[PDB]
From a paper:
Particularly, Centrosomal Protein 190 (CP190), a protein originally described for its ability to bind to the centrosome during mitosis, was shown to play a crucial role in the insulation function of various IBPs. CP190 is composed of a BTB (bric-a-brac, tramrack, and broad complex)/POZ (poxvirus and zinc-finger) domain, four predicted C2H2 zinc-finger motifs, and an E-rich, C-terminal region. We propose a general model for insulator function in which BEAF32/dCTCF/Su(HW) provide DNA specificity (first layer proteins) whereas CP190/Chromator are responsible for the physical interactions required for long-range contacts (second layer). BTB/POZ are a family of protein-protein interaction motifs conserved from Drosophila to mammals, and present in a variety of transcriptional regulators.
Numbering used by the authors:
A (entry chain A), B (entry chain A): 2 to 122
């Protein structure tokens, strides 16, 4: 009646890879972000939610059209795409000239893990 | 115009922890599994989907009542609860007498990562 346990090591690594693949192939995505140029980014709410509550506030305060969430003017693909990629990977890819805007954006979201990264000690 | 990048190390570890917390507090859960005794387990579809396609087949073949998915008779809490916990943690906790049933269940799901673990070389 004793409970034993066996484990898979580095589960976070394993699980992470599966999610990135899903994001790439747009499998199991349950939120569509729409930008001013009508381009759209399909994401997993849950991935978003692990790093920030900001998107919870957006779905409560922004327009929903065609099942897609209209992004506010200061939150367009130039900052959202690299921030979302960061959410999936731990890695932020960016042009240096985007540093300030990304940092200000992370602060406005209170996305602590990202602003800590951008502030680099 | 050159793209640089900075990273957070061990992102899988970080992300994993956030998801387990969500599962514990039942935040952002989007699927309710219901067992014969009317008990229910609330989960994230996406976590389920990373290890198996079985639940995709269940939502296409099983009854949906009160927004809850009726689990088939051979798929009750005795195997589902430890298998789902494994999905979130990489760890399978179980009583030895459950070994055979868990292994047969993993095989019926074609949940490769779990049956490999249970077969231990």
């Amino acid at each position: 009646g004793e409970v034993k346990s066996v484990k898979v090591d580095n589960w976070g690594v394993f699980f992470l890879q599966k999610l990135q693949n899903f994001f790439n192939k747009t499998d199991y995505c349950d939120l569509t972000l729409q930008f001013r140029d009508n381009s759209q980014l399909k994401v997993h709410r849950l991935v978003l939610s692990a790093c920030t509550d900001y998107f919870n506030v957006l779905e409560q305060t922004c327009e929903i059209v065609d099942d897609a969430l209209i992004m506010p003017n200061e939150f367009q693909a130039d900052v959202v795409v690299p921030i979302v990629n960061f959410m999936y990977t731990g890695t932020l890819e960016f042009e240096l000239k985007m540093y300030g805007k990304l940092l200000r954006t992370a602060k406005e979201m209170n996305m602590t893990v990202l602003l800590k990264l951008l502030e680099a000690h």
